[PDB]
Structure formats: structure tokens, C-alpha cells
Design a protein around this ligand. Structure first.
Ligand SMILES: Nc1ncnc2c1ncn2[C@@H]1O[C@H](COS(=O)(=O)NC(=O)[C@@H](N)Cc2ccc(O)cc2)[C@@H](O)[C@H]1O
Ligand SMILES: Nc1ncnc2c1ncn2[C@@H]1O[C@H](COS(=O)(=O)NC(=O)[C@@H](N)Cc2ccc(O)cc2)[C@@H](O)[C@H]1O
Lengths: 266, 266
């Protein structure tokens, strides 16, 4: 006879980090809208993180970002087509550069979504980290309009908070779009707006930087007659309000007691 | 010191059945086109499997299907809205009835995909089973056209066999569509057409059966001013040519030596 209520062999039970969980749900949501997920490098060149995105040096625009500059030789940074790219190395301050990398390597129309680890030299509080995650979205093609950008975010909201959810766009500035916008989604269960990210219609100069770089590389231009929208949102910010996490600093804390609480969450 | 090349603790390693793998890839493909996966019951009523789909008794159409009829009382079969549905019980000869179940329970526009176990009383050879799986697709809404149906299958093909793949539609008969069609996809690596399934524009009488049933249930009509396409394809047939399985009869064989070969395949 056996005491069946007794503890069984202690096999380990794993789990996924909350950021991974949230990233997965976001990617699932945008995959249903036809977006494909691709990643870019964390250590990026000033050209891709800034210049290509219309953010030149010694101007108010640069002063908006808190960049971590790197040093060291022998480091090889490959470009969109495996080429050796040059320029001052840095930690990407956002996922946006992957927006230029993808476009030089592909041809429209397309829909991508790019999650990624980003870095910014700033003070860490309960809603700010120096190391966090963003999700870029980019849809380029003939006839793409801001209504499509609004439609996309509307879908995000519905998918994330149900039918009684809604979105709100307000104008904001980004050297890489025009029109530019910041957006929030209505969280019905919590009764308040959440400022998720920035977006807009890809800037004419960004498309120009892309084809110009394509030419240096010997590729034909590909973005002369197309338009497109792009957005960038905070993964931790969404995870926090979604999984009820009170302090952004927990994410990178490595505390098993914290992590293990998401073994269930998918 | 330790002989690190020695075998480690024999922890078990699992795997998923090939049908599960293939179903997952198909669902992933259609999810990217905006389709949502829902399942229906295996034991179905003659009303949903036939009558609603415009297949009346004692007519050539019925004689096309090899139905397994069931018997026994005390069995409760619930309808789209949990109601108690009546009629001669049977094993569904296809996933198509889920096409009527979903429509009475929801309102257009929408896009569903419904994988499922189906049954047919026929001889089992290397490409025929009495118990196999199908994947229905249904997209209903204002302005839906056959071009959209062709577009869908075109996407399936591209996603399944790459850019050098193509589709072929030929007319065929189904009491539940009009136009009706059968389709094949070009398998570039194998140099030959594969007859995947049937499809067409949902029949006017099917939409009528749906709303008529909705009225009995007290719901307002919902399919008067919409059109839609639907398709049904063989999962095993696609898995076979996709995973190189020579005999359909292996699937339900339960032979571990067979199954374990797909531990890798995702
Ligand atoms: N220090 C920090 N810690 C945690 N999350 C942070 C953060 N700094 C920013 N975030 C999150 O990052 C989101 C976007 O960052 S941002 O600096 O405001 N905007 C950007 O970086 C741009 N790349 C956004 C963008 C705008 C337009 C586009 O077409 C594409 C992208 C914010 O909405 C916020 O939720
Ligand atoms: N006995 C069997 N064993 C294995 N696979 C089988 C089978 N009998 C059929 N199949 C697979 O099932 C697919 C479709 O089955 S079928 O009887 O030809 N067609 C149907 O059942 C219909 N419901 C298809 C359909 C047609 C139009 C629509 O709008 C929706 C669906 C075939 O293309 C074939 O690949």
C-alpha cells in the first residue's frame, strides 16, 4: 500500500520572465495583423541610432536622449547586409534603428515588429529604468496612411483590454516622423489612460537615408513612392499595468520569488 | 574527478504528434491573416453536419459522404448557444458544420479557422483514413469575394512552400458553396501539384439556415447583407508531403518509434 497524498519526486518546474511573456503577447497581437518579428543588435552605430533617423549632433534633438557611448577596438559591427559598418559605437537608445536596418535589407510592402533591449543613461525610479525593452512597429507601402497607424493601435487596445477599450493620439515630436504622435490606450478595468508610446508617418528624410545607403551598397532605390507608419512602445510599462507589477526595477532583480509568480501566466 | 562524457540522469524527453505540429503551423499561417481558431464537437447532429449545409436526405449529395451513425440515449448534445439540439446523432464527416455553429453564435465580419477530427466510413489505404483531420476556414463580411478566397490560399501556398509556390483552383461541387471549387498548391521542391481541399463562396441557403436558426433562438438575423468564403483542407495530406510521411495509417498507429521522429520538428 502507498500514501498517495505524499510528495512526489521533486522534478524542477520552470517559467518565463515577465518581459518574455509580455513580449510574446504583443508579438502575438501584431502577428494577427500581419506583422513579422525581427530583431536588431543592442550595440549600434551612431549612424543607425541617430543620423539615419534624422537626429544630427549638437542640436536640441540629440539632447533629448541619454546615450551610453562605448569604446574598444577589434569589435566588428555588421550592417544590414553583413557589411562592416563604421561610426561611434553606442548602446541603442531605442529600437528605431532596426527600422532603417530592415528597410535597406528589404523591399516594400511589408509589416515588421521588432522587440528589443534598449539603454538610456538616466535615473531609475519606479517607472524608469536605464535598461528596458521596446517594441517597434513599421509598415511601409503604397497608400499607407495615418488612419492605418490609428487602426493598428486601436487593434492593440481591443486585443489588450477588450471591446470597451479605446485609443488616444496627440501630436508630439520625433525627428523620424511627420506627422508625429504619442498615444495612450484606455484601460477599462483600471479606469485610466496609459501612455504607451510614440508613432507617426515615417519621415521623408528617413526614406532618403535608406535608399542613399542602399546606393552606397549598390542596391536600387526602393522607397521613392511609398509611405509608412512606425511606432515604439514600452514593454515594461505595459507588463506592469498588465501583470500588476508596482516597480519597474523588479524586472532585472533576478529574485526567484518575484519571477516564480509568473509560472502560471502562459 | 569525473568522466564528463558519461551519460547523465535519464530525464524523459517529450514530443508532439505530427498532426499537432502540422495543425499548429496551419493555424499560425492563418493567424497571420487575421483568422481565429475555434473548435467544434466531434459527435454532431444531422442538422449541422448536413441539413444546415444544404445536404438533404435521399439525394445524390448525401450519397457522396460515408457517415457513421450513432445510437444511445442520455447523451446531451449542446448547440451553438448551449441549447439542447435534437436530431440523429452522428460523427461529423467534416469540419463544415462548425461553420454554421459559429455563425449562429456570432455576428459578421469575422475570420475563423477550425481544425478538427473528422470521421468517414471508408476503406483505409496509404492516403485514406476513416479517422483524419481537416481545417475549415470561414471569412464572412460585406464585400467578401472569391478573389479574397484565392488570395487566402495563395498566402497558404507562399507560407508553406516559399515564393516559387503557386495555387490552382478548378470548379467542383459542394451543396454549401456557389461558386464551388477544389484547389491545389504547387510544391516546388517536389515538382508536383497537391490537391489540398475544397472551397467556395458560402451558399445563400446556408446563410438562410443560419438566420432561420437564429430566429428560432430569438436572435436577430445577421447574414442578410454579407457574403463569404470557406474552405476545408486535409491536415494529414499536408503533413505527409511536408514531413515526408509515406503512409497515412502511421498517424494513429501509436508507434513511439514513429512519433519520436518529430521531437525535433518544432
Ligand atoms: N527610462 C525608461 N524606462 C522605462 N521605459 C522607458 C524609459 N524611457 C522610455 N520608456 C518607454 O519608451 C516609450 C518610447 O520611448 S521614447 O523615448 O519616448 N520614444 C522613442 O524612443 C521613439 N523611438 C518612439 C517612436 C516614435 C515614433 C516612431 O515612428 C517610432 C518610435 C515610452 O512611451 C515609455 O513607455
Ligand atoms: N478518407 C480520407 N482520409 C484522409 N483525408 C481525407 C479523406 N477524405 C477526405 N480527405 C481530405 O479532406 C479534404 C476535403 O474533404 S472533401 O470530402 O473532399 N470536401 C469536404 O469535406 C468539404 N467540407 C470541403 C469544403 C468545400 C467547400 C467549403 O466552402 C468548405 C469545405 C480533401 O481535399 C482530402 O485531402
Amino acid at each position: 500500500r502507498v500514501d498517495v497524498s505524499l510528495p512526489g519526486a521533486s522534478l524542477f518546474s520552470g517559467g518565463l520572465h515577465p518581459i518574455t511573456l509580455m513580449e510574446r503577447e504583443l508579438v502575438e497581437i501584431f502577428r494577427a495583423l500581419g506583422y513579422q518579428a525581427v530583431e536588431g543588435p543592442e550595440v549600434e552605430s551612431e549612424f543607425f541610432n541617430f543620423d539615419a533617423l534624422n537626429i544630427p549632433e549638437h542640436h536640441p534633438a540629440r539632447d533629448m536622449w541619454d546615450t551610453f557611448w562605448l569604446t574598444g577596438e577589434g569589435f566588428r559591427l555588421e550592417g544590414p547586409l553583413g557589411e562592416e559598418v563604421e561610426g561611434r559605437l553606442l548602446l541603442r537608445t531605442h529600437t528605431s534603428p532596426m527600422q532603417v536596418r530592415y528597410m535597406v535589407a528589404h523591399t516594400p510592402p511589408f509589416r515588421i515588429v521588432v522587440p528589443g533591449r534598449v539603454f538610456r543613461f538616466e535615473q531609475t525610479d519606479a517607472t524608469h529604468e536605464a535598461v528596458f525593452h521596446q517594441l517597434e512597429g513599421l509598415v511601409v507601402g503604397e497608400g499607407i496612411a495615418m488612419a492605418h497607424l490609428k487602426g493598428a493601435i486601436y487593434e492593440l487596445a481591443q486585443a489588450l483590454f477588450g471591446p470597451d477599450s479605446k485609443v488616444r493620439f496627440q501630436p508630439v515630436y520625433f525627428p523620424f516622423v511627420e506627422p508625429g504622435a504619442q498615444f495612450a490606450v484606455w484601460w477599462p478595468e483600471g479606469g485610466k489612460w496609459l501612455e504607451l508610446g510614440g508613432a507617426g508617418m515615417v519621415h521623408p528624410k528617413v526614406f532618403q537615408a535608406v535608399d542613399a545607403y542602399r546606393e552606397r551598397l549598390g542596391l536600387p532605390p526602393a522607397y521613392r513612392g511609398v509611405t509608412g507608419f512606425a511606432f515604439g512602445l514600452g514593454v515594461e510599462r505595459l507588463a506592469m499595468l498588465r501583470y500588476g507589477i508596482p516597480d519597474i526595477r523588479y524586472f532585472f532583480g533576478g529574485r526567484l520569488k518575484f519571477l516564480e509568480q509568473f509560472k502560471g501566466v502562459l
